Amino acid sequence: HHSGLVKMSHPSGDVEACMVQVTCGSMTLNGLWLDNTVWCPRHVMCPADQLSDPNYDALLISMTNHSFSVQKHANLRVVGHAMQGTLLKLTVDVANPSTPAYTFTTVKPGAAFSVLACYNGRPTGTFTVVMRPNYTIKGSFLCGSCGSVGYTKEGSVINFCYMHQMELANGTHTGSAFDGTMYGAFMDKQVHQVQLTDKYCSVNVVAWLYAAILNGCAWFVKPNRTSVVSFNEWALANQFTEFVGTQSVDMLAVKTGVAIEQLLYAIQQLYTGFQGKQILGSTMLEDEFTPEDVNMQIMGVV
Amino acid sequence: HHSGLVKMSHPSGDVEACMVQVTCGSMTLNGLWLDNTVWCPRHVMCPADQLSDPNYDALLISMTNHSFSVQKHANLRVVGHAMQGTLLKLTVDVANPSTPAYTFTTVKPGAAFSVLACYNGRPTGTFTVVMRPNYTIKGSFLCGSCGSVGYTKEGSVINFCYMHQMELANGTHTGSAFDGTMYGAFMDKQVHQVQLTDKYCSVNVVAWLYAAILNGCAWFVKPNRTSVVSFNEWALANQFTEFVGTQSVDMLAVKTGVAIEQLLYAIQQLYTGFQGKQILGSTMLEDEFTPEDVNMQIMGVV
Ligand SMILES: *[C@H](O)[C@H](C[C@@H]1CCNC1=O)NC(=O)[C@H](CC(C)C)NC(=O)OC[C@@H]1C[C@H]1CC1CCCCC1
Numbered sequence: 264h265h266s267g268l269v270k271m272s273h274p275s276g277d278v279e280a281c282m283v284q285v286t287c288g289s290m291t292l293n294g295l296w297l298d299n300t301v302w303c304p305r306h307v308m309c310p311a312d313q314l315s316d317p318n319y320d321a322l323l324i325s326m327t328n329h330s331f332s333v334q335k336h337a338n339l340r341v342v343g344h345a346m347q348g349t350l351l352k353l354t355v356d357v358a359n360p361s362t363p364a365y366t367f368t369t370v371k372p373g374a375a376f377s378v379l380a381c382y383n384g385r386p387t388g389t390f391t392v393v394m395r396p397n398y399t400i401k402g403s404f405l406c407g408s409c410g411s412v413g414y415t416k417e418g419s420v421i422n423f424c425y426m427h428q429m430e431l432a433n434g435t436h437t438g439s440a441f442d443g444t445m446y447g448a449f450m451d452k453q454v455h456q457v458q459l460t461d462k463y464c465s466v467n468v469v470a471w472l473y474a475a476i477l478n479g480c481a482w483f484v485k486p487n488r489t490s491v492v493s494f495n496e497w498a499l500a501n502q503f504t505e506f507v508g509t510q511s512v513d514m515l516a517v518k519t520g521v522a523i524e525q526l527l528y529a530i531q532q533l534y535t536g537f538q539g540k541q542i543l544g545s546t547m548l549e550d551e552f553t554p555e556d557v558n559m560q561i562m563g564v565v
Numbered sequence: 566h567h568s569g570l571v572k573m574s575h576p577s578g579d580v581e582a583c584m585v586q587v588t589c590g591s592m593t594l595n596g597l598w599l600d601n602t603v604w605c606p607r608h609v610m611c612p613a614d615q616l617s618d619p620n621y622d623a624l625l626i627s628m629t630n631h632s633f634s635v636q637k638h639a640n641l642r643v644v645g646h647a648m649q650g651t652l653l654k655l656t657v658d659v660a661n662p663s664t665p666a667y668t669f670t671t672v673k674p675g676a677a678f679s680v681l682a683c684y685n686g687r688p689t690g691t692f693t694v695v696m697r698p699n700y701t702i703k704g705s706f707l708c709g710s711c712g713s714v715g716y717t718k719e720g721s722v723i724n725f726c727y728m729h730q731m732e733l734a735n736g737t738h739t740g741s742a743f744d745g746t747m748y749g750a751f752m753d754k755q756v757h758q759v760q761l762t763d764k765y766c767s768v769n770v771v772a773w774l775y776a777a778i779l780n781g782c783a784w785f786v787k788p789n790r791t792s793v794v795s796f797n798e799w800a801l802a803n804q805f806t807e808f809v810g811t812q813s814v815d816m817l818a819v820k821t822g823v824a825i826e827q828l829l830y831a832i833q834q835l836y837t838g839f840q841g842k843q844i845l846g847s848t849m850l851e852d853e854f855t856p857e858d859v860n861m862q863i864m865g866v867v
């Protein structure tokens with residue numbers, strides 16, 4: 264049996280129309296052109312020899328407007344520049360005529376978003392990831408991908424939440440929000456940095472166990488229950504996020520007739536082992552699908 | 566460690582600009598508007614009471630041009646209609662001004678393609694799948710999704726390979742090629758149909774074991790080797806596709822210094838069990854990534 268679950272991204276066309284190339288003569292990376300503003304990682308200003316301890320304030324001072332070359336695949340004349348956190352805000356003389364309705368938001372651990380991977384201002388692929396509890400994502404990015412963007416979509420409105428910055432020693436990725444902050448405790452410097460420990464996203468594991476029930480797979484469901492408070496105490500000792508219920512989880516509980524606390528108990532038992540059994544073809548807990556994924560893909564509920 | 570592998574779809578914008586809604590008064594589904602032609606599943610002509618044994622030849626005869634309502638989210642005036650296999654070809658009076666460069670191709674088992682899931686002519690998500698050895702895909706489709714399209718991209722050229730038709734009793738999906746044939750032995754009738762048995766895609770399992778080596782994970786590699794001929798004899802007895810090497814696999818062998826026949830032996834041993842170990846965080850063989858995925862995402866080679 265197939266669960267009906269796939270890694271589903273938003274259609275990317277509206278964001279593709281916003282991608283540009285930004286060059287400073289050292290690095291080339293991607294930017295996001297909205298209205299009269301082009302957003303891009305500030306390490307475009309960095310010569311390669313200084314990526315390990317850049318002094319971005321001094322680099323910024325050393326630039327003028329024509330230090331930046333912006334191209335859409337048009338040349339966009341830069342008429343202002345500023346730095347916000349780990350991002351540059353370039354003002355250009357032409358408003359993007361394809362600017363979608365948009366907001367800037369921060370994504371929280373466990374939540375999914377879509378990524379448009381771009382190289383040299385050209386969109387090359389799209390994928391979806393969940394923000395990990397340690398503020399990394401398990402992405403697919405190579406040299407030249409910085410400035411690739413992550414977003415969610417509410418209706419017609421694109422909520423931009425991520426601009427790609429760097430790969431960590433363990434192959435995971437991180438980037439900035441459009442307030443210029445890096446996710447987590449990371450710095451946009453190419454040096455060893457402590458990485459917080461990752462954790463299983465409990466709410467998403469619950470979502471996946473509900474997807475299993477919705478597919479007729481419920482061997483792991485017993486009358487036994489663990490309260491949210493008790494589970495969260497356990498979680499802190501076992502590399503699980505604390506569980507916080509949402510209306511999307513509640514909708515899964517209503518549809519299946521299985522209580523959240525029954526699946527919190529199940530998780531505690533499954534964590535110790537699947538005892539040779541499988542759940543939706545897996546022998547380990549899956550936390551890469553959200554309650555909203557399950558509601559939308561299996562139940563049709565957005 | 567993260568492998569650097571994700572399920573990567575093409576950017577969807579060029580195909581989004583080709584999607585329309587087609588209605589006959591019973592069903593509404595999606596169509597693909599290229600040049601002056603709109604392609605859509607022929608069961609748009611079907612009243613719901615007849616989806617189990619439709620007589621499509623008689624339905625076709627009963628239609629006229631204005632039996633079909635085509636809308637882009639514009640109304641497109643239908644000025645000709647024809648049936649090719651399980652698809653209708655509607656001729657419209659306006660050429661799609663956003664028609665990309667395109668071809669029609671058939672996809673083969675093990676190969677990946679991108680899907681744009683659409684409802685009521687509106688793109689709603691994108692995902693990637695591999696064509697299974699039994700000519701199904703493990704997709705995510707609900708009522709109203711027929712006419713959603715699958716495609717690959719070579720350069721600027723979109724190779725359309727799939728138009729969605731139906732869900733099978735086991736939750737998997739199938740559809741047609743743009744020559745009008747259904748993939749596999751399936752019929753576009755809503756009745757019980759025998760499903761061929763699925764198999765592990767050996768070439769993709771080899772690709773994934775190479776991705777593991779490229780990530781520093783090679784515990785399963787021994788000097789022991791199994792020839793292609795011997796492996797393929799084994800595969801026929803063990804629900805594996807026969808292995809056929811390609812230049813993309815050869816490139817992985819060259820980069821890692823590990824021979825194909827070493828990984829064919831590894832597969833034969835791993836099939837019987839991982840003995841408590843993991844490979845790229847999995848306890849079972851993974852066949853949803855292609856040699857080309859591994860070359861592109863990990864090595865940068867398209
Ligand atoms: C921008 O395109 C680029 C994206 C990276 C490149 C490879 N994959 C990606 O996702 N980002 C960078 O090159 C970034 C630049 C700094 C933020 C200024 N540097 C980066 O990602 O470097 C990666 C290497 C692994 C980290 C340094 C090691 C850490 C562990 C100790 C040894 C050094």
Ligand SMILES: *[C@H](O)[C@H](C[C@@H]1CCNC1=O)NC(=O)[C@H](CC(C)C)NC(=O)OC[C@@H]1C[C@H]1CC1CCCCC1
Nearest residue numbers: 608706707708709710711730731732734753754755757
């Ligand atoms: C078109 O949008 C639609 C897509 C389907 C609906 C649900 N998920 C999908 O992917 N396609 C159909 O509705 C299709 C129409 C026929 C081809 C004319 N019918 C379809 O997919 O029916 C699905 C149900 C499961 C199959 C019938 C059972 C088979 C096993 C025995 C019992 C009947």
